[PDB]
Amino acid sequence: VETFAFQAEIAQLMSLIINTFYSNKEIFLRELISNSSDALDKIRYESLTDPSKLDSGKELHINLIPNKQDRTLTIVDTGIGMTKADLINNLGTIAKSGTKAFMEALQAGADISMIGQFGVGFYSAYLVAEKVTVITKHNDDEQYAWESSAGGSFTVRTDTGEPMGRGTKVILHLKEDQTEYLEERRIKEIVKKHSQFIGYPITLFVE
Ligand SMILES: N#Cc1ccc(N2CCN(CCCCc3c[nH]c4cc(O)c(C#N)cc34)CC2)cc1
């Protein structure tokens, strides 16, 4: 297991998301589903020129899987997946400018629900999760687990869990007072409200 420090500005953003009083937390799900959709768009586009990229799985879709026993909500997709370099370097570097702009916008009167307009919607996960685990598999690479409970650091390791084929699984370890997002009717409500026209099947598992 390798442990890394967040860039200072990203650590600052995560603390802001964790510490700021803001009741409209449900928007986290839209941001994560949007990121899944983008990843599915990507593998779909690449396969138009290289069909063999779907050898790792042809079905393009999103599963939402609540687990009250583990207190997790998992978002699973069969998109393009992420490389080790994505998890350690690339996505963090890209996030620097959007993080800066978002925090400046909040100072000028924007609210947290606008976070996706700055390309850093992922971090809204920490509105509801004490820990986020991301398992991912890209065609050109091994299966990895990225994880962070904030506090300035994250880890990356090779994942030895069930093989995924291709795609990304975001496991939200929910805060004790955010278990409403494990309820079928609540998740259904949020998907209909904010993610109504996503161009891939979204299957909400029940327990
Ligand atoms: N400094 C720094 C720094 C160093 C690393 C990170 N992480 C780099 C990995 N990220 C993993 C989540 C990426 C965002 C995401 C949410 N739902 C998805 C669904 C998907 O299908 C794909 C794909 N493909 C992507 C996502 C976390 C942040 C941050 C900051």
Q: Which residues line ligand 1 (CB under 6 A)?
A: 6-7, 10, 32, 35-36, 39, 77, 79-82, 87, 91-92, 95, 122, 134, 146, 154, 168, 170
Instruction: Note down the domain range covering 60.
Output: 1-207
CB 54 within 8 A of CB 182: no
Q: Atom 9 (ligand 1): residue with closest C-alpha? A: 87
Name the experiment that determined this structure.
X-ray
96 annotated among ligand-binding-site residues:
yes
Q: How many CB atoms lie within 10 A of CB 99?
A: 24
Tokens of 88: 């350690």
Query: Would you give the DSSP letter of residue 68?
Result: T
Domain of residue 55, CATH code: 3.30.565.10
**CA angle at 87 for the pair 67 and 24, rounded to the nearest 5°:** 50
Beta strands, E only, 138-178: 143-148, 153-158, 167-174
In terms of DSSP H, where are the helices of the chain?
A: 8-19, 27-47, 84-85, 91-107, 184-194
Total count of domains within the chain: 1
